[PDB]
Ligand binder design. Structure first.
Ligand SMILES: CC(C)(COP(=O)(O)OP(=O)(O)OC[C@H]1O[C@@H](n2cnc3c(N)ncnc32)[C@H](O)[C@@H]1OP(=O)(O)O)[C@@H](O)C(=O)NCCC(=O)NCCS
Ligand SMILES: O=C([O-])CC(=O)C(=O)O
Lengths: 434, 434
């Protein structure tokens, strides 16, 4: 009823049988071609993997189990006295494919509060970490060290049946998610608050409220933003570096902790998790080379010169998207509500007007419209979250929801080891010549 | 001259041009189809990525830049009056494509000795890890925390040109390799030697010798085995999970510490680098019930029983290879030459003539021969390396050589972000209809 585990237990056999049938019939159906260019181009356009939780039509944006961001904003349960969707309900949707009732989201909130205790070696390790070790390295090192708690690793060693793998994965995942705000808040304070304590988990609050409590924020609006941020960053298909990494590491039957740890090292890379910071630093240098309240034409020039300099306009474009990312739109709406008269936000909203006009004239874009990262950093800066390095930790906490939801299903459906074939250049050349 | 960097700096242009020419010829040539089965089957049989350092012909075995294991054994520089090839020599071959001279291997030994100092924060972190935290997990956290030392991460933040990326990756990679044995040895000592110190690096010893010295071993043969072990586990194509993970994380421009750390989370998986242990356990379980001594049908029972029980003669087959891993043969030869009157080796050898009888007879199989992992554990055990949990750490240290050789080339060749396309079952079901 409210026990996610029994609900999942009921869904899984339906889904096994539905895939078994599908593979019997259409297993040998060709869905795409592989070229030389795709092999050297990082599997671009290559249909690589099955990923159930979410799907990104390049035209209309991410869909969580068929539901768009707007639909989730409406249907997903909210906090009492709040407007933004709770991450809890997102997670439930990703795991069950069903919109949760208020009671199930409350149940889940209690489960995650109850599983939030950190083992002392992990506390100790975060507290001894130096201030020059980046937040994302700290997050990953600590999640890896939490695998001491892994049910799944201990059970695998003792020869547990394949049919039961997903149960241990689920427990481990519920444990990880529950703990992530503690880990992340402990990093936040140790770096940016002279190592002050994270305080206590309130058993009756939602995941995002305990998190902001542990971060030291009391602004109700920052808690609403967090709930909106953690929902919308939760998943973005299987092919993004962090989801693919966790999928790949998961398939060797590495436990959730190690799987997720690997995903964060993926997310720590510039071309994945840093665009947020890359946009903010530019917006700051923009308002420091053109000044505030500038002119739409003065702006049009800055954009032109930037592209003539051969530099990118950060936050505009996507690997696969070809339109305004709904996660951008999502954030704009929240800005229009709670901080419409913010210098930086007006600038962002100004750049929405100009930037999609160039790039398409430049001819080089395909996607001239903005992505999520164009809009996230000014919301975070607005509420006093100014430490840019830390931003990707927030992304990572969010992305746990997506990839762990899917990891449960990957194990439920017995997905095997990911292991493609590679070729050398010299080997490719001989192969094409035959 | 003896500077690997300058040699590499002169190789790179030639290789870039050679790939440019190839893509300009065959960019759009089809080299494979993607089926629905492949997407469910973890990309099995799909030609996904380019990987230059090594190539696995499914018939003959692994080739490092063209050379087979026997060729490497005859050709590669060995240690003073030793018999086994130095890993240093292997790494030079993978980077350059060229068999190194004695002088080049001597220079490379020294470079790694000079780069071996651990930051204190890593030292502290390792000394504070508990004994219930797996050696592989310690290794992976330690490497991640080493990314505070990263040249490449710092340089990228400052806007360094693309054309220099490989140079910093080379610096980060040399330092990591240099430091790996220190980490690995500290883990060994903290778990299995009451936290006794690893001692000093010796500037006039090879990489493997400093490693055994730090492990606390003083057997000349053990050092020889290590040299051989670290050479032959070094690389095995790009499709394996540890190589592919590092390739994938690497493609976000995550530095080599993050990339390697994610690969260790991948290697830590039971379907990747835990076989070495399984064999030694299963062997002992055989040598208990059946006794040290065994007959042929004595196996037939165990095997058929186990194959009819759902288990499998451990490490007796691969997922792409379809023959007798030459790596085993390398070890068998070593034992016959050094540990012949050893009971467990005698048994492993006694199993090399019998097991082969079935497998094909079962029909439900592909490789009717052993792999690398069927034979490593007994050798290690012979020399007092009895801590099975640690065995994968030795694999980790080895595998650094392959994935980092490739990582330099990847950034040098300007390989882009790995971003394939995922589909839901729901989505795949619609796609086939049209
Ligand atoms: C997301 C991104 C990496 C996609 O790269 P991609 O799919 O390989 O690029 P495309 O297929 O659009 O390539 C077409 C051209 O448009 C360029 N382009 C894409 N977005 C651009 C932008 N905002 N400003 C300028 N040029 C841009 C590409 O660099 C490329 O230039 P080139 O062919 O002359 O070398 C790219 O749009 C980008 O760098 N965006 C800015 C950073 C960002 O917002 N990242 C976060 C999203 S993950
Ligand atoms: O989709 C991608 O490849 C990158 C990304 O924005 C994400 O993971 O959210």
């Amino acid at each position: 009823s409210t026990n996610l585990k029994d609900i999942l237990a009921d869904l899984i056999p339906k889904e096994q049988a539905r895939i078994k049938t599908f593979r019997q019939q259409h297993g040998k159906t060709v869905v795409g071609q592989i070229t030389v260019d795709m092999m050297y181009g990082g599997m671009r356009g290559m249909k690589g993997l099955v990923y159930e939780t979410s799907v990104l039509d390049p035209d209309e944006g991410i869909r969580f189990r068929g539901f768009s961001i707007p639909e989730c904003q409406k249907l997903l349960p909210k906090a009492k006295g709040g407007e933004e969707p709770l991450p809890e309900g997102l997670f439930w949707l990703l795991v069950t494919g069903h919109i949760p009732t208020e009671e199930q989201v409350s149940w889940l909130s209690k489960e995650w509060a109850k599983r939030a205790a950190l083992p002392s070696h992990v506390v100790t390790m975060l507290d001894n970490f130096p201030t020059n070790l980046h937040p994302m390295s700290q997050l990953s090192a600590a999640v890896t060290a939490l695998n001491s708690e892994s049910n799944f690793a201990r059970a695998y060693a003792q020869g547990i049946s394949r049919t039961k793998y997903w149960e241990l994965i689920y427990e481990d995942s519920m444990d990880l998610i529950a703990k992530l705000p503690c880990v992340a808040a402990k990093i936040y304070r140790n770096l940016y608050r002279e190592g002050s304590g994270i305080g206590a988990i309130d058993s009756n609050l939602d995941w995002s409220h305990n998190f902001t409590n542990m971060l030291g924020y009391t602004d109700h609006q920052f808690t609403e933003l967090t709930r909106l941020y953690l929902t919308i960053h939760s998943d973005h298909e299987g092919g993004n570096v962090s989801a693919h990494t966790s999928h790949l590491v998961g398939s060797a039957l590495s436990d959730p902790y190690l799987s997720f740890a690997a995903a964060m090292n993926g997310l720590a890379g510039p071309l994945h998790g840093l665009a947020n910071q890359e946009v903010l630093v530019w917006l700051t240098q923009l308002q420091k080379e053109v000044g505030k309240d500038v002119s739409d034409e003065k702006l049009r020039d800055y954009i032109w010169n930037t592209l003539n300099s051969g530099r990118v306009v950060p936050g505009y474009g996507h690997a696969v998207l070809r339109k305004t990312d709904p996660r951008y739109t999502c954030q704009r709406e929240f800005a229009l509500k709670h901080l419409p008269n913010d210098p930086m936000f007006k600038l962002v909203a100004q750049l929405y007007k100009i930037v999609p006009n160039v790039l398409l004239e430049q001819g080089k874009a395909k996607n001239p419209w903005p992505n999520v990262d164009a809009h996230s950093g000014v919301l975070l800066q607005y509420y006093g979250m100014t430490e840019m390095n830390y931003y990707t930790v927030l992304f990572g906490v969010s992305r746990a929801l997506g990839v762990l939801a899917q990891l449960i299903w990957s194990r439920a459906l017995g997905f095997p080891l990911e292991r493609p074939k590679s070729m050398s250049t010299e080997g490719l050349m001989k192969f094409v010549d035959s």
